[PDB]
Design a protein around this ligand. Structure first.
Ligand SMILES: *[C@@H]1O[C@H](CO)[C@@H](O[C@@H]2O[C@H](CO)[C@@H](O)[C@H](O)[C@H]2NC(C)=O)[C@H](O)[C@H]1NC(C)=O
Ligand SMILES: *[C@@H]1O[C@H](CO)[C@@H](O[C@@H]2O[C@H](CO)[C@@H](O)[C@H](O)[C@H]2NC(C)=O)[C@H](O)[C@H]1NC(C)=O
Ligand code: CA
Ligand code: CA
Ligand code: CA
Ligand code: CA
Ligand code: 3CO
Ligand code: ZN
Ligand code: ZN
Lengths: 426, 426
């Protein structure tokens, strides 16, 4: 109704925050130079964060853990602001290059100036440079440090501080503005809305990808609604378990059953081979089918080259990359594709107008490949007086270039800066 | 159930706890290698502890502050028991030889194994071995850490943990068995009664000595119940102060006031010249009188030479030192003074037998000053076979020597390892 079938579908999807935790040098000393103790402290903290976020339809999964026992990798300091900035930066150039994860939190033993015990970018979830938070190991009671960490992840997820009239009960909520040991594990009604709205407007993609059981480095917990190595199923505690196929007490399948949760499981048995589990969502998707022996249902799409969106594009890995949609994504609503003559600028091989790079040398487009180099857009309005406009980033010169798989002519799409036949496998 | 004059006199005396605080390397790093920040943290803690103890008639005074900003002087470990043992030993070895104080507390940034945040010796106040405690800077809230420290100092002062039946109101008291952020700043009735009994039974002497205004290393504070440099009076914070003589806001005496506290002060005025402020406690004491120009009552004694203890001793600076009590004070009940022949070992001039030290060289006693060197005693045990026994401490060779002013002959007393006539001013 108010939400597109895309938004609606995104909201109903199960969310997962693949968390990476870091403990600083002071944490290592604080716990007696006992990596076993530091690690344990971190597990206990995640064991508290997880149930807190389950009430927000998000499963927090520790997919990575690092302890700077040898020395800090960033300049951890009294200023929370500077530390956050340095941690996020380090996360972007160092950590994200060797370990994929949706969010990172720094647990430090230092004392931040002021009464705050943490800091996090508001709405930075999934962002390559802002999905981060830092937390002070401010109390001996670990469930209070977990709440502080949950609070920062709260901001990361688009939530603000609870204001005078927000409530979750008789006690303070996770997003309360200040500390207290009366802190509960519940989110206020306001946080619920903020978060929901944030998702509606931003739909961060990374939290839809479920972590592999083998990617979780935290000791398995039976009853946390996530199947971890050593478990066959997990429907929660024996009191909340609604899955007849699973014995919530042992996290083992109940005699007979072959599976429990999933699109390819019926009455505790593998759906029939060739049975449809997930229908196609769009003209570039292909109905998914069960294999009979598996419990999960692999997702497959149409073969690249399938005409889509009223002969305006060709399917590419599940999507329908169109030049009109790209212009809108770069310059906002109203943006239209520039007239053909504008693309001639790509034959220049100049600083912005080219088709590809050999290594660092920009190679001008061929007369026939003009539509596969730099994208030229025109914000359609009475004002603007320039038919040709480009989007450029000094950080990544590839940004603003026509996307691969984009229709560049009849029966042709861009491959590697070249307009080629969609009938040839790509 | 009765109370002796000495006990009541002890109970009535104002108490002081000349406190020495130490911070370990972790504290240094925890506060960004900022000595100002660390010191401020310690002052803040002292600020919460002082009003907590003034209610117990105890005036806390910081006479020492040491921050191990280079290296720990001991191996600070996650085991509390081991860290206490090591700290107390470092205190009894490296700190007391460099500074005189009544009790020391180690404020560490490390985490102690278990739920505890500190440890201290029960009733070890003033003891050179056990007047110590350790406290974990376990919370960002400095007033909670302060309560933890007051708890250890509490143990040091003879208080046990509270029982379910002990109370000080609605919130838990300082001596609560376990942590909690609802902790109050009050001592339960049980703690107050145990403490009274501990004082009547042990009467620790170091807490009777008031520290000089120049011994306090903490920045002067108006409202800390201690008259420091630049203050005329101090009755605590303006809100609590009930002193009709003091201006709590400026720590200045109000208009028409000559004094605020003192045995020779009454209703803000000096008592008349000649008024008795302290009755003589014994035969070597003399009733003291006010000058009419001072709030204090200088303790004057009988003139040295005054025969005391049924002509067995001569008054010396308010006391009647005699060999018979000295032997008991060194070897316990039953010990008596050895026969004259024993003191001849002082003519030796060697290790234990001598009269005094010139510098690093021991001088032997001349036949006449034989009874003014090392004291000789012997136990009453029927199994004792030795007539001459001495007390020796390689730590302080003077310990065990006949006390100054001790009666050595018919009408003579020991001076500087010499038996001189008591008819000469001394
Ligand atoms: C390192 O820390 C760990 C845990 O913090 C210590 O192991 C604990 O040892 C106690 C016995 O004193 C057991 O009751 C706990 O169950 C252990 N914890 C776990 C689950 O490992 C370990 O002793 C420490 N090592 C050192 C040398 O300090
Ligand atoms: C070193 O730590 C001290 C903390 O005592 C900082 O000095 C000021 O301390 C007062 C409290 O006593 C605060 O109100 C001020 O805000 C502190 N200064 C500021 C503006 O930070 C001092 O700044 C610290 N120095 C460094 C290098 O951070
Ligand atoms: Ca599980
Ligand atoms: Ca599909
Ligand atoms: Ca003062
Ligand atoms: Ca006197
Ligand atoms: Co007082
Ligand atoms: Zn916040
Ligand atoms: Zn205790």
């Amino acid at each position: 109704s108010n939400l597109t079938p895309e938004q609606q579908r995104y909201l109903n999807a199960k969310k997962y925050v693949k968390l990476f935790l870091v403990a600083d040098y002071i944490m290592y000393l604080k716990y007696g130079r006992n990596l076993t103790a530091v690690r344990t402290r971190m597990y206990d903290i995640v064991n508290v964060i997880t149930p807190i976020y389950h009430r927000m339809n998000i499963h927090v999964a520790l997919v990575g853990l690092e302890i700077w026992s040898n020395t800090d990798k960033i300049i951890v300091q009294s200023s929370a602001d500077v530390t956050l900035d340095l941690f996020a930066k380090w996360r972007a150039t160092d950590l994200l290059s060797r370990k994929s994860h949706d969010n990172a939190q720094l647990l430090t033993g230092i004392n931040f100036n002021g009464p705050t015990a943490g800091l996090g970018y508001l709405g930075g979830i999934c962002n390559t440079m802002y999905s981060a938070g830092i937390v002070q190991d401010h109390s001996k009671i670990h469930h209070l440090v977990a709440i502080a960490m949950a609070h920062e992840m709260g901001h990361n997820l688009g939530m603000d501080h609870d204001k005078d009239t927000c409530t979750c009960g008789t006690r303070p909520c996770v997003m309360a503005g200040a500390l207290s040991c009366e802190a509960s594990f519940l989110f206020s009604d306001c946080s619920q809305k903020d978060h929901r709205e944030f998702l509606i407007k931003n739909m961060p993609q990374c939290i839809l990808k479920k972590p592999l059981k083998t990617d979780v480095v935290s000791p398995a917990v039976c009853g946390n609604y996530f199947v971890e190595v050593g478990e066959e199923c997990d429907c929660g505690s024996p009191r909340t378990c609604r899955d007849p196929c699973c014995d919530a007490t042992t996290c083992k399948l109940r005699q007979g059953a072959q599976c429990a949760e999933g699109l390819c499981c019926d009455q505790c048995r593998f759906k029939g081979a060739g049975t449809e589990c997930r229908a196609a969502k769009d003209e570039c998707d292909m109905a998914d089918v069960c294999t009979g022996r598996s419990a999960e249902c692999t997702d497959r799409f149409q073969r690249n080259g399938q005409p889509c969106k009223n002969n305006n594009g060709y399917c590419y890995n599940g999507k329908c990359p169109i030049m009109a949609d790209q212009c809108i994504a770069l310059f906002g609503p109203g943006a239209t594709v520039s007239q053909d003559a504008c693309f001639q600028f790509n034959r220049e091989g100049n600083h912005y107008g080219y088709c590809r790079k050999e290594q660092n040398t920009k190679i001008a487009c061929e007369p026939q490949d003009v539509k596969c180099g730099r994208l030229y857009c025109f914000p359609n309005s009475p004002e603007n007086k320039n038919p040709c406009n480009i989007y450029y980033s000094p950080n990544d010169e590839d940004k603003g270039m026509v996307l691969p798989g984009t229709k560049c002519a009849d029966r042709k799409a861009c491959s590697n800066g070249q307009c080629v036949d969609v009938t040839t496998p790509y």
